[PDB]
Amino acid sequence: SDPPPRDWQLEKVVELSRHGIRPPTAGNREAIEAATGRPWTEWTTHDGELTGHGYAAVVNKGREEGQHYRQLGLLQAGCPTAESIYVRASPLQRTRATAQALVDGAFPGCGVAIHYANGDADPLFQTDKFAATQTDPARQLAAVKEKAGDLAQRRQALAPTIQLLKQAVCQADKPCPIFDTPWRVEQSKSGKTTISGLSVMANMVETLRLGWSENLPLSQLAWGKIAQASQITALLPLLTENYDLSNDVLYTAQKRGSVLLNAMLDGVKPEASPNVRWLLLVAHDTNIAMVRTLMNFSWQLPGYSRGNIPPGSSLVLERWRDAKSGERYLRVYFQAQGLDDLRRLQTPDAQHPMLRQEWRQPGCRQTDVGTLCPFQAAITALGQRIDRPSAPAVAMVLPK
Amino acid sequence: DPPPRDWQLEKVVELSRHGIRPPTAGNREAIEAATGRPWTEWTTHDGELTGHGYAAVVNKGREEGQHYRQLGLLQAGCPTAESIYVRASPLQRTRATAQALVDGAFPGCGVAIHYANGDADPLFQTDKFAATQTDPARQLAAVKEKAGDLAQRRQALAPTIQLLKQAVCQADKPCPIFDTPWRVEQSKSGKTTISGLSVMANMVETLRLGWSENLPLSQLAWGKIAQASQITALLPLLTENYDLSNDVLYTAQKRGSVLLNAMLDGVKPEASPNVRWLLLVAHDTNIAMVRTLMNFSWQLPGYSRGNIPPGSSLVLERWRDAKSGERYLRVYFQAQGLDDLRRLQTPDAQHPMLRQEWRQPGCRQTDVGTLCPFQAAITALGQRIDRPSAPAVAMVLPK
Amino acid sequence: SDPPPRDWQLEKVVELSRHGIRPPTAGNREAIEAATGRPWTEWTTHDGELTGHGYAAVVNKGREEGQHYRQLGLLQAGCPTAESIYVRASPLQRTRATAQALVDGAFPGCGVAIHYANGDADPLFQTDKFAATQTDPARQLAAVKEKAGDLAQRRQALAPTIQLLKQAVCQADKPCPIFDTPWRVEQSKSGKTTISGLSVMANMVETLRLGWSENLPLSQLAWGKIAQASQITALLPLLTENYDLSNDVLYTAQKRGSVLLNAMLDGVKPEASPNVRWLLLVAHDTNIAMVRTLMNFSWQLPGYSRGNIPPGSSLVLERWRDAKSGERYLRVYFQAQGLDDLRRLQTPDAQHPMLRQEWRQPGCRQTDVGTLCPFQAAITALGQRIDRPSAPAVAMVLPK
Amino acid sequence: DPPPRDWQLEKVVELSRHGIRPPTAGNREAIEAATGRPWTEWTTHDGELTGHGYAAVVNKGREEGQHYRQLGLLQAGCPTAESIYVRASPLQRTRATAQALVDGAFPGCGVAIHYANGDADPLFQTDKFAATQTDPARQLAAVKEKAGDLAQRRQALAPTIQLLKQAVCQADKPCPIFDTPWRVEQSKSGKTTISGLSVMANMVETLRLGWSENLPLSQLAWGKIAQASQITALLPLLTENYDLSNDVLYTAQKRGSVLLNAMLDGVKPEASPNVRWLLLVAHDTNIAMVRTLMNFSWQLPGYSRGNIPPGSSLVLERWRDAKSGERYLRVYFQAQGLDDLRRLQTPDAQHPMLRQEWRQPGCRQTDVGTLCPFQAAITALGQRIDRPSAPAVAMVLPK
Ligand SMILES: [Mg+2]
Ligand code: NA
Ligand code: NA
Ligand code: NA
Ligand code: NA
Ligand code: NA
Numbered sequence A, C: 001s002d003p004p005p006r007d008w009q010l011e012k013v014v015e016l017s018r019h020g021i022r023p024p025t026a027g028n029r030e031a032i033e034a035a036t037g038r039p040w041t042e043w044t045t046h047d048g049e050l051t052g053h054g055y056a057a058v059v060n061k062g063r064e065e066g067q068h069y070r071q072l073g074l075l076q077a078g079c080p081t082a083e084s085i086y087v088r089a090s091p092l093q094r095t096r097a098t099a100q101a102l103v104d105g106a107f108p109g110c111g112v113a114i115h116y117a118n119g120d121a122d123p124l125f126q127t128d129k130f131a132a133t134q135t136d137p138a139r140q141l142a143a144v145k146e147k148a149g150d151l152a153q154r155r156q157a158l159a160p161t162i163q164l165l166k167q168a169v170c171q172a173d174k175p176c177p178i179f180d181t182p183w184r185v186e187q188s189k190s191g192k193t194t195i196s197g198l199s200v201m202a203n204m205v206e207t208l209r210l211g212w213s214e215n216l217p218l219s220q221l222a223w224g225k226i227a228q229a230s231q232i233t234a235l236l237p238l239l240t241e242n243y244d245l246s247n248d249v250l251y252t253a254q255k256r257g258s259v260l261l262n263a264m265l266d267g268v269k270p271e272a273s274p275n276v277r278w279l280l281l282v283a284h285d286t287n288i289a290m291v292r293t294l295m296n297f298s299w300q301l302p303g304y305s306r307g308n309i310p311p312g313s314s315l316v317l318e319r320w321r322d323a324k325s326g327e328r329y330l331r332v333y334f335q336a337q338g339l340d341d342l343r344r345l346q347t348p349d350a351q352h353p354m355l356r357q358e359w360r361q362p363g364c365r366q367t368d369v370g371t372l373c374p375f376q377a378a379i380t381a382l383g384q385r386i387d388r389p390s391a392p393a394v395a396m397v398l399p400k
Numbered sequence B, D: 001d002p003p004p005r006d007w008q009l010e011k012v013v014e015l016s017r018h019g020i021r022p023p024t025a026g027n028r029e030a031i032e033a034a035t036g037r038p039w040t041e042w043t044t045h046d047g048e049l050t051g052h053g054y055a056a057v058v059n060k061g062r063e064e065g066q067h068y069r070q071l072g073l074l075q076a077g078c079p080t081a082e083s084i085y086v087r088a089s090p091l092q093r094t095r096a097t098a099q100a101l102v103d104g105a106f107p108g109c110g111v112a113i114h115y116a117n118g119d120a121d122p123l124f125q126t127d128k129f130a131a132t133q134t135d136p137a138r139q140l141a142a143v144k145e146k147a148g149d150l151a152q153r154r155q156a157l158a159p160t161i162q163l164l165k166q167a168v169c170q171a172d173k174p175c176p177i178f179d180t181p182w183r184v185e186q187s188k189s190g191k192t193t194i195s196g197l198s199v200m201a202n203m204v205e206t207l208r209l210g211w212s213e214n215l216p217l218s219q220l221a222w223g224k225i226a227q228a229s230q231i232t233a234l235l236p237l238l239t240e241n242y243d244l245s246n247d248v249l250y251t252a253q254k255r256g257s258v259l260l261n262a263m264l265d266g267v268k269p270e271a272s273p274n275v276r277w278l279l280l281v282a283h284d285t286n287i288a289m290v291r292t293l294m295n296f297s298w299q300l301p302g303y304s305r306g307n308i309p310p311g312s313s314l315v316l317e318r319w320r321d322a323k324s325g326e327r328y329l330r331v332y333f334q335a336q337g338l339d340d341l342r343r344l345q346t347p348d349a350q351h352p353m354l355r356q357e358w359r360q361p362g363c364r365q366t367d368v369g370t371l372c373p374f375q376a377a378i379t380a381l382g383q384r385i386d387r388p389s390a391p392a393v394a395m396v397l398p399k
Helices: A026-036 A052-071 A095-104 A138-150 A151-157 A159-169 A198-213 A229-235 A237-244 A250-268 A284-295 A340-345 A375-382 B025-036 B051-072 B092-105 B136-147 B149-154 B159-168 B197-212 B228-232 B234-241 B247-268 B284-294 B338-343 B374-381 C025-036 C053-070 C093-106 C139-149 C150-158 C159-169 C198-211 C229-233 C237-244 C250-268 C287-295 C339-341 C375-382 D025-035 D051-070 D092-105 D138-145 D149-157 D158-167 D197-213 D228-230 D236-243 D249-266 D285-292 D338-344 D376-380
Strands: A007-017 A085-089 A185-187 A193-195 A279-282 A315-320 A328-335 A355-359 A365-367 A372-373 B007-017 B084-088 B184-187 B192-194 B277-282 B313-321 B327-335 B353-356 B365-366 B369-373 C006-016 C086-088 C185-187 C191-193 C278-283 C312-322 C328-336 C355-360 C365-369 C370-374 D008-019 D084-088 D185-186 D193-196 D277-280 D313-321 D327-335 D352-355 D364-365 D371-372
Touching: A007 A250, A007 B136, A026 A198, A052 A095, A052 B051, A095 B051, A138 A159, A138 A185, A138 A193, A138 A250, A138 D138, A151 A159, A159 A198, A159 A237, A198 A237, A198 A340, A229 A340, A237 B247, A250 A284, A250 A315, A250 A375, A250 B284, A279 A284, A279 A372, A328 A375, A365 D149, B007 B092, B007 B247, B007 B284, B025 B197, B051 B092, B051 B197, B084 B092, B084 D051, B084 D193, B092 B277, B136 B184, B136 B192, B136 B247, B149 B159, B149 B197, B159 B197, B159 B234, B184 D249, B192 B197, B197 B228, B197 B234, B197 B338, B247 B277, B247 B284, B247 B313, B247 B374, B284 B313, B313 B365, B365 C198, B369 B374, B369 C237, B374 C139, B374 D193, C006 C093, C006 C250, C006 C287, C053 C093, C053 D051, C053 D092, C053 D193, C086 C093, C086 C198, C093 C278, C093 D051, C139 C185, C139 C191, C139 C250, C150 C159, C150 C237, C159 C198, C159 C237, C185 D352, C191 C198, C198 C229, C198 C237, C198 C339, C229 C339, C237 C370, C250 C278, C250 C287, C250 C312, C250 C375, C278 C287, C312 C355, C328 C375, C328 D008, C370 C375, D008 D092, D008 D249, D008 D285, D084 D092, D092 D277, D138 D249, D149 D158, D149 D197, D158 D236, D193 D313, D197 D236, D197 D338, D249 D277, D249 D285, D249 D313, D249 D376, D277 D364, D285 D313, D327 D376
Parallel strands: A007 A279, A085 A279, B007 B277, B084 B277, C006 C278, C086 C278, D008 D277, D084 D277
Antiparallel strands: A007 A315, A185 A193, A315 A328, A328 A355, A328 A372, A365 A372, B007 B313, B184 B192, B313 B327, B327 B353, B327 B369, B365 B369, C006 C312, C185 C191, C312 C328, C328 C355, C328 C370, C365 C370, D008 D313, D185 D193, D313 D327, D327 D352, D327 D371, D364 D371
């Protein structure tokens, strides 16, 4: 490495990470097995929990990240103190274990603890469980229908991708129910709004992507039908489509993601509590999608479709200072590993770097540390779509 | 006086312990009763392979794959059916460890592992098969005979017991286990244990595993243990318990002969399956019985005599000198150190695996390690095998 | 450690180190053996070369120093580049080997090279070998006599210390010539000005101090007569006195030290060549004494007399920046290890820290990183006594 | 089946190599002639102990002192006349290494070392004493007999020779040594060498020492060598040369018997001097002859068979079980790894010394290592000693 930058100084990191690789959730399994009329692989990890390979991949990212932040002088050599980091994970096993993996890698052998809510609902993450942040089913129905438009036309436009999925998952000369169902907007008794057909197809594509990333034997991924990363990439358009029509619907993102984006923007400002160098939040792709929608931030990384959120990927806000003037800037980016890098447990070292895309707007400047945006203007732009009634203050430090 | 050599590695037979787990459900009940307090609940289910445990096993498997490619045992790239066969005990923790090993050794290659359909593999769960079960009266006598004066044994380990008590007992509260005399105990199903000692051994294994896991110190032993040397100081209790259980010769003969026999058969030419690397993944109890039958033990840095760390393994290597055509066996045990496990250090050139080799007269020092004339080595290693307890198994399972 | 400072940023280090522990020089030995009428211990190291124990002690300081500068974010993690450091050593073996020891410690296993002049004279260090920087014997005679004043009175005032030295080094009922010689100003045929009696006594005290620091057996240090560090400390007043009347004479320091102080002050300024994070110069106590005299900087560290310069000790200038404004400051200090720490090869970790004294003047402020002085005013004050004709520009990067 | 034990370490006898040196003057002449080019001039005089070498030895001695205090062999604080006696070969490099060891082991204690007044110590410079010199005709025959077909030996090491040539030869220039057939050569004073091989061995030792020294890569092998594995790959040439010189049994018997005899006598009770630790500091040639008489060799991570790194040592430990009163011998060789030396890594719990133990039938694994019944061990270790070449020496020198 070259010596660390002096003219630019990193002050604060706020990071929102997805959990690492998991098998399908119990609900996902029910759906995909019904959709294809056959059982899918049972993994060595319990459905919905972080797999060992998932933990290992997250450690690899955390290790390179900790080295990077020591190199830049944000963190101390050796083990951290309370001033170094605060980790808040969604209370699910998969997110707690992912949070452990990140600090396990970033601070080798340091026994760094994580924090999570006592109950099974954290108001930053399980926003459908709190009055201020719940959607109204009637509004969500309208919103999804408005964005979806002609669903027959969307289904026809995805026909080639649907065909690739069918080839991978359907048994020769057997019923494959899901490919016969027309795409329509449906609501559950709890008022969750999904698209018939597409939503379960999206569950299938995520499961295949996760199985690829896991390094499952090919015989156990899609019955030997998928053998290269490009074949996963070709399926991802269905997942993007489902996201466009669920988590990335503005109404839904405003109701269910405003509290988290608000917490993140406040967290990157000076005078944040807790007073730490790195605030690390670990949650779900749902949360990341809603936040990036409110940010109006879109990405497309090599080997992935638009907006894809891989396991152990993260959205980062960094506050930087021009040391020649004290003027503050924000850097905003999304990072992930590629499909084969995850499968191979490749460390994201200098030669196989993380995939990354930075947000920008007029007035941002390209520096040796990344794209830096005047701080207040960046905060204002990123926060425009926040629904204030849906963004109550949350104490970041869990009482614990 | 070594002759001209052209060393070629022909076959590896490896018996690995599973990686790091939290206490088993049974362990937890015993240790929580023994100390009168709850112990940390890990993010991994009791008895399963932890994420950190998986990561540490990947690291070992990655360097091992590189090594055996460098030696020409394994071809470049992904393996074939002739490269490797992996058989794991059917428990989640052993299945998951088997996966981690080939995940590291053959990056991104989707290498499968194999395990029994039921809850019992006749190589590993040997107490579930008549031919390989101990007789209760014979086992009781063997354990009594080896234990001798247990009051003296307990008094001899007093400093170690005190260190354990300091770590796990609450000030000004009862701590039941430390008040129990050590006595032989035998269950209705025939399992012989030592009262006091055996539960203390469970406690020490739990603390060693929690250290190796990189648990926060507050959740390891309530902040009382902060360095690896404090774990090392407790391990004599684990060695003592092993001496009086898995390492009792009679027990090892009944419950371990089938596995050692299978390993010695696997390392000979014409083995089924025909693979360059036979990888077996099981439990410390299995390794302990096997090494006892071999009359082989070890002492590695930071560990007590015969300690079997998570992800450690016993290895048999068959070597040929391509010039003379003579064949040799190399036998060793390998593990990572305490801090290396805690830190997820990959075992590279600067941080090598800890290793000790077996030898007997006739063995020679070579550029590839201690190599022993093959026939004499297999014969010597099999001398303690109890023939009626060694039925031949099919190594390749159904699928 | 706590996280590195953000409001204060270290930009540049310029360091002038003494060589590490050596046996007496060949000249020293001749003098001290004549002075006491007996042979002194022959060390395992050649006279005047860096001892192995000396190298080890210097490595210990370099190792903690490299860790410190990575912690503060001046240096990169891992091995350095050309931008990290430039090391220029006096061409003597003792100074080359000391320079190697410092980077050996600071950058473990990195094979960092050092630089030194092809000949046996470097114009920053062997200043008596270059026309612009040589003293005139007639002026030096006047200068030493002026400062020395009544030498009989100085000798009488040091009588208790002289007695302690006699006790350590003189044989019972044998001639010890040096203690009979009156103190007078003398000049050699080359025009070097020394004080008779005192100068050789100072040679003796340095040799004893170095033998203590070396961990020589007590039987080989002063024939068993010195057994604790306090006994070395008690002798050091003679060394301070000799320094006051040689290297610390203003005239001499101006002629022979201006070129080096000038190079050092220019080196800590922005726009210095070479463009490096750390300029490390390795030379002799003579050079350090002249420089601190020109700086008007005096120190007294625990266990040492005023101005003492221990083996492997150094004078440091650091340029710091207030990251809230870009305003620049200078920190100036002298550092060493204590006598027992050197003898024991103690690493100067957090629990046995380097002994240090900082320079200051009105306007300096105490910060969490040390005493910081407004940069231009500090440069001006430190440079007041430079004799400009004696301070020619020197290319810092050796052609080489 | 171990009995109750209370292990007490009673005596250590240690034979250490000197630490890192540059090439000797003689080495430099040979290697510069062999490659037709000047080699780096170090800041240390040819053949002397380097500053880095001193520092690395201090590190080892520091951890060793701590260890032997922890075991109760050495009292707390500074030693007494009964704690240690240090005898070094009279060369600067060995005297300086002896100092470094006690400098580390007993911080700030002014511990003295001892050496012969002349240029020859009868334990170490054995060729300078009639009883312990080889006969020229017998030595020539022994070396010829072991060497056999040297053309085959040279052809067998061709890949290694090529790696050396790539590191040290200038492109498009003559490199004399690589064009010489390997032949037995005997000087007028009786010294037997192998043409080609012996100078290549000098080159490999120089490169290994330069690596260990932390020389800039540009000054090591003109930038051609950048990692430890490249040094490891060259070491077979050093092993080959040792096999045909210091490790020839006849040679070792004549020139090594006096030293092994003194070591075995020193490790027995009632030794003179009465000290807890007898420390001898000499040369790789001495260690090689001693281990050959012991029929003991090793292979440590990153090193070829029997390699003797700078600051490495052979150790004999006499242990007593305080319960039974039985006595045991433990025998091992220890060294630091290549990167550890280069980096001046202290050998702490996380970076332990590399070690291999000797054993024979009857030895047992214990909590303090491989321990061998004392009388049987000393007898077995002394079996190859040539009695006429083993006069008794006074261990304590005049001063
Ligand atoms: Mg290390
Ligand atoms: Na840093
Ligand atoms: Na689209
Ligand atoms: Na659990
Ligand atoms: Na004075
Ligand atoms: Na030299």
